[PDB]
């Protein structure tokens, strides 16, 4: 089932322990592997004591739809994973943010949903968890230890985030109009005006493919195609010590910019390696992360490298004929 | 699966001395190790978790260190109550394992 | 505040079945994994079994696997260990143990006083 990128699932020994601010793209990935980022989100926003993801890690998180394709690739980054790396922000839920029906919000402490204008998260505090509907957090004595399993987390939709190639606004307007033409029925998506209607049905579930292009709102699609290109970058690689764990920034920088470390074939054909010296010792090894590559989508005659792309459930209001 | 080995089996030391028990794990368990004090009649008591952390309310003379396979449990200044048997326990693999132990006697 | 009151020990003969119970007070029992640790006469400690907060995850040592069954009623705040096919090796003092996380990961924080089980004919 998926598997960790670098670091196995955590076994946390104290719920009051702190969440350190590590600086390397490997230490960050390791914290992602162990759901340290989602636990931090809980501590800040929902005033929550402890860690979520004990012994499970990111790989044991629950998805909706549960048959989640991207999950099978450990390298593909969920909206929370991009949050921990700075690529985007998952906002704290407000009253207006509509909780979509269909997922199994029961016992969940955290769940995350891509919205039409961004990414939103709902949390529960200490000793509480979500009721069947997801509208309320209520006392849950099975959440009392503060060292909670990974299935308490719910990531909605088959989403995968990456480094975009920025697009000019003229391209965004082209792509925004084409989506409007393709979904003329829709009035609002997640409260954001999409078409001009003057008569709107009540909010309704909406399953749609979308893409984050780095502008105000996502662009939803019906007819699109995808292609998983392999484009080498530094973030294609994580560097690790086989027993110490993730390496430090200065070490990993020395690996990726100085050809001083070791690693698998693709890394050596990017940065540089060496062998025939290691007697017993220990030196950082760098390996390729497990993903098909960077995703490129074709839509409206144009071809874009998005920040995030996936098929999730948003809330849309339709026309009243 | 994982078979912990402690050394020495026994150790005699007088009050005020430094007592250094060592524990060894057949495989790498990172820092997933605990140390326990057991005295005759009374139940075991948990001193160190994560191989270096002090349990709440335990004197600062007790310590712990190590990571990987070789670990260490040290009493900086022995006290008369500190005479008991001590155990190390791994929790990296789901079957938890106690080492053999180490009895602490008093030099006379 | 956090106590564990064991009960059920006694004199049973080889091939008989005893039942042990561990009443937990002072903490939210349903949110913590529990253990059972035993110590035979003249020997060291030996972990026996563990149960998760839900009861959904159980784990046992090799020496007892298939004979001893660990269970918990989280509406009465008592932990159980069901002994079967008992043997002289099982002659020991049986301690129940409270852990720190949802599962019984192996942090033997708060113990009970213990109960003696003796197997001979
Ligand atoms: C929840 O709040 C914690 C803080 O209590 C957040 O962690 C903090 O994140 C900021 C932003 O990345 C860190 O600031 C950074 O400082 C370094 C130098 O130390 C600087 O180079 C960076 O540019 C940035 O300014 C801060 O250090 C860090 N603190 C800790 C203790 O982790 C955390 O990100 C919040 N949760 C989520 C999900 O974002
Ligand atoms: C869990 O972690 C907390 C924080 O590290 C521990 O509490 C601190 O422990 C030290 C040493 O006992 C004290 O000096 C501090 O005053 C404590 N801080 C607070 C805010 O309580 C706590 O003891 C740990 N718990 C366990 C089970 O070991």
Numbering used by the authors:
A (entry chain A): 21 to 341
B (entry chain L): 1 to 108
C (entry chain H): 1 to 121
Show me the paper's own sentences about this structure.
Severe fever with thrombocytopenia syndrome (SFTS) is an emerging tick-borne zoonotic disease caused by a bunyavirus, SFTS virus (SFTSV). The genome of SFTSV is comprised of three L, M, and S gene segments, and the M segment encodes a membrane protein precursor that undergoes proteolytic maturation to produce two glycoproteins: Gn (the N-terminus) and Gc (the C-terminus) embedded in the viral envelope. It has been shown previously that Gn plays a major role in binding to host receptors, and a number of effective neutralizing epitopes targeting Gn have been identified. To elucidate the molecular properties of SD4, SD22, and SD12 binding to the SFTSV Gn, we prepared protein complexes of SD4 Fab, SD22 Fab, and SD12 Fab with the Gn head and determined their structures using X-ray crystallography.
The structures of the SD4-Gn, SD22-Gn, and SD12-Gn complexes were determined at 3.3 Å, 2.8 Å, and 2.4 Å, respectively. SD4, SD22, and SD12 bound to domain A at similarly-perpendicular angles. Epitope mapping revealed that SD4, SD22, and SD12 largely recognized the same epitope, with only six of 18 residues differing among them, which was consistent with the findings from the competition-binding assays. The buried surface areas (BSA) of Gn in complex with SD4 and SD22 were 893.4 Å2 and 891.7 Å2, respectively, which were slightly greater than that of SD12 (853.5 Å2). Specifically, SD4 and SD22 formed eight hydrogen bonds with Gn and its associated glycan, whereas SD12 formed 11 hydrogen bonds. Additional shared interactions included H-D101 and L-Y49 in SD4 and SD22, which bind to Gn residues Q73 and N33. Pairwise overlaps were observed: H-S105 in SD4 and SD12 interacted with Gn residues S32 and Q73, whereas L-E50 in SD22 and SD12 bound to S32, Q73, and R74. Interestingly, SD4 L-E55 and SD22 L-Q55 formed a hydrogen bond with the N-linked glycan residue N33 of Gn, an interaction not observed in SD12. However, SD4 and SD22 H-Y102 formed stronger hydrophobic interactions with P168 and the hydrophobic atom of Q73 and R74 side chains when compared with SD12 H-V103, potentially accounting for the higher binding affinity of SD4 and SD22. The results showed that the mean KD values of SD4 with J1, J3, C2, and C3 were 62.8 pM, 61.0 pM, 32.1 pM, and 82.7 pM, whereas those of SD12 were 60.2 nM, 70.1 nM, 74.1 nM, and 87.8 nM and those of SD22 were 55.7 pM, 47.5 pM, 51.5 pM, and 54.2 pM, respectively.
